[PDB]
Amino acid sequence: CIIFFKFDPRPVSKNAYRLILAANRDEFYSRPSKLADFWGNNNEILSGLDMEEGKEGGTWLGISTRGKLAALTNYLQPQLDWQARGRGELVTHFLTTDVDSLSYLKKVSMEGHLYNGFNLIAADLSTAKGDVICYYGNRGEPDPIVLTPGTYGLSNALLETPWRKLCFGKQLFLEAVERSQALPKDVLIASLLDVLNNEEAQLPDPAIEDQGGEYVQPMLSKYAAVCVRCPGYGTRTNTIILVDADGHVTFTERSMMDKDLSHWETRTYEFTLQ
Ligand SMILES: [Cl-]
Protein backbone atom coordinates (compact mmCIF):
# COMPACT_ATOMS: atom_id res chain seq x y z
CA CYS A 1 0.00 0.00 0.00
CA ILE A 2 1.07 3.68 -0.01
CA ILE A 3 -0.54 6.90 1.21
CA PHE A 4 0.38 10.57 0.88
CA PHE A 5 -1.48 13.33 2.70
CA LYS A 6 -1.00 17.02 3.44
CA PHE A 7 -2.71 18.22 6.61
CA ASP A 8 -3.34 21.87 7.51
CA PRO A 9 -5.84 22.38 10.35
CA ARG A 10 -5.61 26.19 10.33
CA PRO A 11 -5.82 27.03 6.61
CA VAL A 12 -4.66 30.56 5.89
CA SER A 13 -7.19 31.20 3.11
CA LYS A 14 -10.76 30.33 2.09
CA ASN A 15 -10.14 27.79 -0.70
CA ALA A 16 -7.11 26.10 0.85
CA TYR A 17 -7.36 22.42 1.77
CA ARG A 18 -7.37 21.06 5.30
CA LEU A 19 -6.61 17.64 3.77
CA ILE A 20 -5.25 16.36 0.47
CA LEU A 21 -4.95 12.57 0.47
CA ALA A 22 -3.87 10.09 -2.22
CA ALA A 23 -3.74 6.38 -1.45
CA ASN A 24 -3.13 3.12 -3.30
CA ARG A 25 -4.48 -0.18 -2.01
CA ASP A 26 -2.23 -3.06 -3.08
CA GLU A 27 -3.80 -6.50 -2.70
CA PHE A 28 -4.08 -9.85 -4.42
CA TYR A 29 -6.50 -9.50 -7.33
CA SER A 30 -8.39 -12.60 -6.15
CA ARG A 31 -9.71 -10.96 -2.97
CA PRO A 32 -13.35 -9.86 -3.41
CA SER A 33 -14.13 -6.22 -2.69
CA LYS A 34 -16.97 -3.72 -3.02
CA LEU A 35 -16.56 -0.28 -4.56
CA ALA A 36 -16.88 2.80 -2.38
CA ASP A 37 -20.41 3.81 -1.39
CA PHE A 38 -22.28 5.06 1.64
CA TRP A 39 -23.15 2.60 4.40
CA GLY A 40 -23.66 2.56 8.15
CA ASN A 41 -26.65 3.39 10.30
CA ASN A 42 -27.36 6.78 8.69
CA ASN A 43 -25.52 6.24 5.38
CA GLU A 44 -22.94 8.37 7.19
CA ILE A 45 -19.81 6.32 6.34
CA LEU A 46 -18.07 6.25 2.95
CA SER A 47 -15.51 3.59 2.01
CA GLY A 48 -14.86 0.43 0.09
CA LEU A 49 -15.41 -2.88 1.82
CA ASP A 50 -13.46 -6.12 1.94
CA MET A 51 -15.64 -9.14 1.11
CA GLU A 52 -13.30 -11.99 2.06
CA GLU A 53 -15.22 -14.82 3.71
CA GLY A 54 -15.07 -14.33 7.47
CA LYS A 55 -13.89 -10.72 7.06
CA GLU A 56 -16.84 -9.02 5.33
CA GLY A 57 -17.26 -5.35 6.22
CA GLY A 58 -13.61 -4.54 6.85
CA THR A 59 -11.91 -1.64 5.14
CA TRP A 60 -8.55 0.06 4.58
CA LEU A 61 -9.74 3.67 4.14
CA GLY A 62 -12.94 5.52 4.98
CA ILE A 63 -14.51 8.82 5.98
CA SER A 64 -17.76 9.60 7.79
CA THR A 65 -19.87 12.74 7.44
CA ARG A 66 -19.69 13.04 11.23
CA GLY A 67 -16.08 14.13 10.64
CA LYS A 68 -14.01 10.96 11.02
CA LEU A 69 -11.30 9.48 8.80
CA ALA A 70 -8.92 6.55 9.15
CA ALA A 71 -6.57 4.51 6.99
CA LEU A 72 -4.48 1.37 7.45
CA THR A 73 -1.44 -0.17 5.79
CA ASN A 74 0.05 -3.61 6.29
CA TYR A 75 3.56 -4.08 7.65
CA LEU A 76 5.58 -6.05 5.11
CA GLN A 77 6.52 -9.27 6.91
CA PRO A 78 8.36 -12.35 5.63
CA GLN A 79 5.77 -14.50 7.43
CA LEU A 80 2.16 -14.23 8.56
CA ASP A 81 0.37 -15.43 11.69
CA TRP A 82 -2.86 -16.86 10.27
CA GLN A 83 -4.63 -17.11 13.66
CA ALA A 84 -4.59 -13.38 14.45
CA ARG A 85 -7.44 -10.89 14.19
CA GLY A 86 -8.18 -9.32 10.83
CA ARG A 87 -6.82 -5.80 10.40
CA GLY A 88 -9.88 -4.68 8.42
CA GLU A 89 -11.79 -3.99 11.64
CA LEU A 90 -9.33 -1.35 12.87
CA VAL A 91 -10.58 1.32 10.46
CA THR A 92 -14.23 0.21 10.56
CA HIS A 93 -14.59 0.28 14.35
CA PHE A 94 -13.27 3.85 14.42
CA LEU A 95 -15.72 5.11 11.79
CA THR A 96 -18.68 3.45 13.54
CA THR A 97 -18.13 4.92 17.02
CA ASP A 98 -17.81 8.34 18.69
CA VAL A 99 -14.33 8.06 20.22
CA ASP A 100 -11.75 10.74 19.49
CA SER A 101 -8.84 9.62 17.33
CA LEU A 102 -6.19 9.71 20.06
CA SER A 103 -8.36 7.78 22.53
CA TYR A 104 -9.15 5.14 19.91
CA LEU A 105 -5.49 4.58 19.04
CA LYS A 106 -4.63 4.18 22.74
CA LYS A 107 -7.14 1.34 22.93
CA VAL A 108 -5.65 -0.18 19.77
CA SER A 109 -2.11 -0.03 21.15
CA MET A 110 -3.22 -2.04 24.19
CA GLU A 111 -4.44 -4.70 21.72
CA GLY A 112 -1.81 -4.18 19.03
CA HIS A 113 -0.21 -7.57 19.65
CA LEU A 114 -3.37 -9.43 18.48
CA TYR A 115 -2.93 -8.39 14.83
CA ASN A 116 -0.33 -8.85 12.15
CA GLY A 117 1.79 -5.79 11.47
CA PHE A 118 -0.18 -2.66 10.69
CA ASN A 119 0.00 1.13 10.64
CA LEU A 120 -3.11 3.12 11.55
CA ILE A 121 -4.10 6.74 10.92
CA ALA A 122 -7.13 8.10 12.80
CA ALA A 123 -8.36 11.66 12.31
CA ASP A 124 -11.03 13.92 13.79
CA LEU A 125 -12.32 16.43 11.23
CA SER A 126 -14.09 19.41 12.81
CA THR A 127 -14.63 22.75 11.08
CA ALA A 128 -15.32 24.24 14.53
CA LYS A 129 -13.16 22.28 16.98
CA GLY A 130 -10.09 21.83 14.77
CA ASP A 131 -8.64 18.82 12.97
CA VAL A 132 -6.50 16.20 14.71
CA ILE A 133 -4.55 13.45 12.96
CA CYS A 134 -2.88 10.73 15.04
CA TYR A 135 -0.78 7.70 14.16
CA TYR A 136 -0.02 4.32 15.72
CA GLY A 137 1.62 1.15 14.42
CA ASN A 138 2.03 -2.15 16.28
CA ARG A 139 5.54 -2.61 14.84
CA GLY A 140 6.89 0.78 15.94
CA GLU A 141 6.64 2.82 19.13
CA PRO A 142 3.98 1.68 21.63
CA ASP A 143 2.39 5.10 22.21
CA PRO A 144 0.21 6.85 19.61
CA ILE A 145 1.40 10.28 18.49
CA VAL A 146 -0.39 13.47 17.51
CA LEU A 147 0.95 14.65 14.16
CA THR A 148 1.95 18.23 13.47
CA PRO A 149 0.71 19.82 10.23
CA GLY A 150 2.64 18.84 7.13
CA THR A 151 2.96 16.40 4.25
CA TYR A 152 3.33 12.77 5.26
CA GLY A 153 3.99 9.48 3.52
CA LEU A 154 3.08 6.00 4.75
CA SER A 155 3.76 2.64 3.12
CA ASN A 156 4.25 -0.95 4.32
CA ALA A 157 7.07 0.17 6.63
CA LEU A 158 6.32 2.61 9.46
CA LEU A 159 5.28 6.23 8.97
CA GLU A 160 7.92 8.21 7.05
CA THR A 161 10.20 5.19 6.68
CA PRO A 162 12.52 6.37 3.84
CA TRP A 163 11.73 3.72 1.26
CA ARG A 164 12.78 5.06 -2.13
CA LYS A 165 9.28 4.51 -3.51
CA LEU A 166 7.93 6.57 -0.62
CA CYS A 167 10.43 9.40 -1.06
CA PHE A 168 9.97 9.49 -4.84
CA GLY A 169 6.17 9.33 -4.72
CA LYS A 170 6.05 12.04 -2.06
CA GLN A 171 8.07 14.24 -4.42
CA LEU A 172 5.48 13.69 -7.17
CA PHE A 173 2.64 14.31 -4.71
CA LEU A 174 4.06 17.67 -3.63
CA GLU A 175 4.75 18.65 -7.25
CA ALA A 176 1.14 17.88 -8.21
CA VAL A 177 -0.25 19.85 -5.26
CA GLU A 178 1.96 22.89 -5.90
CA ARG A 179 1.26 22.61 -9.63
CA SER A 180 -2.54 22.53 -9.54
CA GLN A 181 -4.02 22.95 -6.04
CA ALA A 182 -5.06 26.53 -6.91
CA LEU A 183 -6.81 25.33 -10.11
CA PRO A 184 -10.25 23.66 -10.08
CA LYS A 185 -10.32 20.68 -7.75
CA ASP A 186 -10.91 18.35 -10.72
CA VAL A 187 -7.46 18.99 -12.21
CA LEU A 188 -5.86 18.42 -8.80
CA ILE A 189 -7.64 15.05 -8.63
CA ALA A 190 -6.42 14.12 -12.11
CA SER A 191 -2.85 15.15 -11.22
CA LEU A 192 -2.90 12.92 -8.13
CA LEU A 193 -4.33 9.93 -9.99
CA ASP A 194 -1.44 10.37 -12.43
CA VAL A 195 0.97 10.26 -9.48
CA LEU A 196 -0.74 7.19 -8.03
CA ASN A 197 -0.31 5.32 -11.33
CA ASN A 198 3.42 6.09 -11.69
CA GLU A 199 5.09 2.71 -12.22
CA GLU A 200 8.75 3.79 -12.18
CA ALA A 201 10.45 1.40 -9.77
CA GLN A 202 12.88 3.11 -7.36
CA LEU A 203 15.79 0.70 -6.94
CA PRO A 204 17.94 -0.54 -5.35
CA ASP A 205 16.14 -0.30 -1.97
CA PRO A 206 18.10 -2.06 0.81
CA ALA A 207 15.37 -1.15 3.32
CA ILE A 208 12.69 -3.07 1.40
CA GLU A 209 14.94 -6.10 0.91
CA ASP A 210 15.87 -6.25 4.60
CA GLN A 211 12.32 -5.92 5.95
CA GLY A 212 10.57 -8.19 3.43
CA GLY A 213 13.32 -10.79 3.40
CA GLU A 214 12.69 -13.78 1.17
CA TYR A 215 9.01 -13.01 0.53
CA VAL A 216 9.68 -9.73 -1.30
CA GLN A 217 12.61 -10.98 -3.41
CA PRO A 218 10.48 -12.16 -6.39
CA MET A 219 8.28 -9.04 -6.11
CA LEU A 220 11.12 -6.53 -5.79
CA SER A 221 11.39 -5.28 -9.38
CA LYS A 222 7.76 -4.12 -9.28
CA TYR A 223 7.16 -3.65 -5.53
CA ALA A 224 9.41 -0.57 -5.31
CA ALA A 225 7.07 1.63 -7.40
CA VAL A 226 4.19 3.82 -6.28
CA CYS A 227 1.95 1.74 -8.55
CA VAL A 228 2.70 -1.96 -8.08
CA ARG A 229 2.15 -4.35 -11.00
CA CYS A 230 3.09 -7.86 -9.85
CA PRO A 231 1.66 -11.21 -10.98
CA GLY A 232 -1.77 -11.40 -9.33
CA TYR A 233 -0.93 -8.65 -6.82
CA GLY A 234 -0.71 -4.87 -6.99
CA THR A 235 -2.48 -1.52 -7.01
CA ARG A 236 -6.22 -2.14 -7.33
CA THR A 237 -7.64 1.09 -5.85
CA ASN A 238 -6.61 4.74 -6.17
CA THR A 239 -8.38 6.96 -3.63
CA ILE A 240 -8.26 10.76 -3.42
CA ILE A 241 -9.82 12.57 -0.46
CA LEU A 242 -10.04 16.37 -0.31
CA VAL A 243 -11.40 18.53 2.51
CA ASP A 244 -11.39 22.27 1.84
CA ALA A 245 -11.49 25.00 4.48
CA ASP A 246 -15.31 25.10 4.62
CA GLY A 247 -15.74 21.32 4.89
CA HIS A 248 -16.63 20.23 1.35
CA VAL A 249 -15.39 16.65 0.91
CA THR A 250 -14.41 15.08 -2.42
CA PHE A 251 -13.90 11.29 -2.39
CA THR A 252 -12.61 9.68 -5.60
CA GLU A 253 -11.92 5.95 -6.03
CA ARG A 254 -10.65 4.34 -9.24
CA SER A 255 -10.87 0.54 -9.15
CA MET A 256 -9.61 -2.29 -11.34
CA MET A 257 -12.57 -4.34 -12.55
CA ASP A 258 -11.74 -6.99 -15.18
CA LYS A 259 -8.23 -7.74 -13.83
CA ASP A 260 -7.00 -7.23 -17.41
CA LEU A 261 -5.84 -3.68 -16.49
CA SER A 262 -8.00 -2.16 -19.25
CA HIS A 263 -11.35 -2.03 -17.39
CA TRP A 264 -11.57 0.59 -14.64
CA GLU A 265 -14.48 2.18 -12.77
CA THR A 266 -14.16 5.49 -10.89
CA ARG A 267 -16.61 6.85 -8.32
CA THR A 268 -16.50 10.40 -6.95
CA TYR A 269 -18.68 11.70 -4.12
CA GLU A 270 -18.93 15.42 -3.34
CA PHE A 271 -20.69 16.30 -0.07
CA THR A 272 -20.23 18.33 3.12
CA LEU A 273 -19.39 17.61 6.75
CA GLN A 274 -21.90 18.13 9.55
CL1 LIG B 1 -22.01 -2.49 -12.69
UniProtKB/Swiss-Prot annotation:
The keyword Cytoplasm applies. It comes from the Eukaryota. GO terms for cellular component: cytoplasm; cytosol; Golgi apparatus; mitochondrion. GO terms for biological process: Golgi organization; protein secretion. InterPro entries: TANGO2. It holds the Pfam family TANGO2. Belongs to the Tango2 family. It is linked to Metabolic crises, recurrent, with rhabdomyolysis, cardiac arrhythmias, and neurodegeneration: An autosomal recessive disorder characterized by metabolic encephalomyopathic crises, hypoglycemia, hyperammonemia, episodic rhabdomyolysis, susceptibility to life-threatening cardiac tachyarrhythmias, developmental delay, intellectual disability, and mild diffuse cerebral atrophy. May be involved in lipid homeostasis. The gene is TANGO2. Keywords: Cytoplasm, Disease variant, Golgi apparatus, Mitochondrion, Neurodegeneration. Its main location: cytoplasm. The keyword rRNA processing does not apply. This is Transport and Golgi organization protein 2 homolog. It is found in: Cytoplasm; Mitochondrion; Golgi apparatus.
